[PDB]
Design a protein around this nucleic acid. Structure first.
Length: 571
DNA sequence: TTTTT
């Protein structure tokens, strides 16, 4: 039985002198067992003797300073566990998942101490986890720009802050660990809770593993949410309008849409209706023109010769080679006119609508009859399951080494292959979800402004008649009227601002309407903006260009990493 | 509005 601890480092800001000036660790299953020093060598010695599992919230940060030490202390990265060797799992994108420090072997059992990332399990800021889990959290933050030489003495205040940080993460991790949720990520915790309910044996027969070629083609039909801005509104300031959000978009699809399963069946040319294999993916070649008065829906995989992340109005003289789920193809045919079509090949699948019902009823129930921590975790169980299917085959990531500077550095590693869960289920879930949003936006075409996965934004304050019957504040799969604004401005996908109508309900500010409001909440949404950068934004300064050097970014220096106030610009 | 100091 390996132990588990919540750990955190408080680091220096000096680009020259970067080091741990305070550390802390807390036994997760025993918060009385804890320590808070000020010496990394002190910490690291312990890290080597414990033979347990550690968890730093946002390993990415703390993981740096950890590598720095290992490299300068008889440790070097190694493929497969070796005495005084250390392996790691860092994705090709810079996401840390595990640092496995090996010390040797006792007969067989590897003597090691694995360091994990809590963020991969509780994907939120500590401050947030505190609030949503209702965990005591001290207000304020340790003075970061205070000169701290080596050996500096930690004050009673800074002490409380550090203990508090690791206790918050400990109280959270413990709840999941108290339910089998002992995986590396939330996703895997969901895949776990999901197998418990249907049985691994049933899972194996339902979601068989596919060949590498078969999976490659199925992925050709995979795509994310539907994010799109109507040009008619691009960069213009508009008046009143409203926002609608689907109640649990994915869970909803998983609960009642016809979803694939089983062994696929290849076919040539155009798919032929088959009752036992209702869903399919068609490899098709054609040209197309967006029907007059319809929203674009075709996105050709980024970086080839078609504006990446943009929905095409037409193929523009060039032939398109696409792999589409039948849900995606039915949609394309209603919004576009297709010419010179060629149906090449495809895959049929058996399908049912009862695969996730038990899973979803269970966790929804808990979510409904629970509060604070339990509730959030339940939502986490419910919202992290879909993604696990749309696996990412190639686990090829970075590899560390001491860079010519005394700082941390990386480069590309060998080529490794992980086995696909069941990608066809991923293709249809996201497809079904897009269909949900897109058909609603299209029915509101005359007022549609912006769409983003599970929400549509319309001009006007009155609920559209075509939408009325599927509008409801709580029901799963329904559209909830989330807000109404007095005015707004959209610049680009996920980049806008609104003046929302707020009212008073029992003592707090809540979304209101034109006929009942007392305030106007200014609201900004832009990929990468902060609470600080936001305070400087307003209607007339919000435009393509707006920039400020207020977005700190990881700049690895000798010893670990530092956050330099860099530049942020709306492009 | 990835989340860390």
């Amino acid at each position: 039985p390996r132990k588990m601890y919540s750990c955190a480092f408080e680091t220096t800001t000096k680009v020259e002198d970067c080091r741990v000036w305070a550390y802390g660790y807390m036994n997760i299953e025993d918060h009385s067992e804890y320590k808070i020093g000020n010496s990394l060598d002190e910490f690291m010695a312990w890290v080597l003797k414990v033979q347990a599992d550690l968890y730093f919230h946002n390993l990415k940060f703390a993981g740096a300073f950890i590598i720095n030490w290992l490299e300068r202390n008889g440790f070097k990265w190694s493929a497969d566990g070796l005495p005084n060797t250390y392996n790691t799992i860092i994705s090709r994108m810079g996401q840390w998942y595990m640092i496995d420090i090996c010390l040797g072997y006792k007969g067989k059992r590897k003597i090691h101490t694995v360091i994990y990332d809590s963020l991969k399990k509780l994907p939120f800021p500590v401050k947030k986890i505190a609030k949503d889990f209702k965990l005591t959290v001290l207000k304020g933050d340790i003075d970061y720009h205070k000169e701290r030489p080596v050996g500096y003495k930690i004050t009673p205040e800074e002490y409380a802050y550090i203990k508090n940080d690791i206790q918050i993460i400990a109280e959270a991790l413990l709840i999941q660990f108290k339910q089998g949720l002992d995986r590396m990520t939330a996703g895997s915790d969901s895949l776990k809770g999901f197998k418990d309910i249907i049985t691994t044996k049933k899972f194996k027969k339902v979601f068989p593993t596919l060949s590498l070629g078969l999976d490659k083609e199925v992925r050709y039909a995979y795509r994310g949410g539907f994010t799109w801005l109507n040009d008619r509104f691009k960069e213009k300031e508009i008046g009143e309008g409203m926002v609608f959000d689907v109640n649990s978009l994915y869970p909803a699809q998983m609960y009642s849409r016809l979803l694939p399963y089983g062994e696929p069946i290849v076919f040539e040319g155009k798919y032929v209706w088959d009752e036992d294999y209702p869903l399919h993916i068609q490899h098709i070649r054609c040209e197309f023109e967006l029907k007059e008065g319809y929203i674009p829906t075709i996105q050709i995989k980024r970086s080839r010769f078609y504006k990446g992340n943009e929905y095409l109005k037409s193929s523009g003289g060039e032939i398109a080679d696409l792999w589409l789920s039948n849900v995606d193809l039915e949609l394309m045919k209603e919004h576009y006119d297709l010419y010179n079509v060629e149906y090449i090949s495809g895959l049929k699948f058996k399908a049912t609508t009862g695969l996730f019902k038990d899973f979803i009823d269970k966790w929804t129930y808990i979510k409904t009859t629970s509060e604070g921590a339990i509730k959030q975790l339940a939502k986490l169980m419910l919202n992290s399951l879909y993604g696990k299917f749309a696996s990412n085959p190639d686990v090829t990531g970075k590899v560390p080494y001491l860079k010519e500077n005394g700082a941390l550095g990386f480069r590309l590693g060998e080529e490794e292959t992980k086995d696909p869960v069941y990608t066809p289920m991923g293709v249809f879930i996201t497809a079904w979800a897009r269909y949900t949003t897109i058909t609603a936006a299209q029915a509101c075409y005359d007022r549609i402004i912006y769409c983003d996965t599970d929400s549509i934004h319309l001009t006007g304050t009155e609920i559209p008649d075509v939408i009325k019957d599927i509008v409801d504040p709580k029901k799963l799969g329904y559209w909830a009227h989330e807000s109404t604004f007095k005015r707004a401005k959209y610049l680009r996908q996920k980049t806008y601002i609104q003046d929302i109508y707020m009212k008073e309900v029992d003592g707090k500010l809540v979304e209101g309407s034109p006929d009942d409001y007392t305030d106007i909440k200014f609201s900004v949404k832009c990929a990468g903006m902060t609470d600080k950068i936001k305070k400087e934004v307003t209607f007339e300064n919000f435009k393509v260009g707006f920039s400020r050097k207020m977005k700190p970014k990881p700049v690895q220096v000798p010893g670990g990493v530092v956050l330099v106030d860099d530049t942020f610009t709306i492009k």
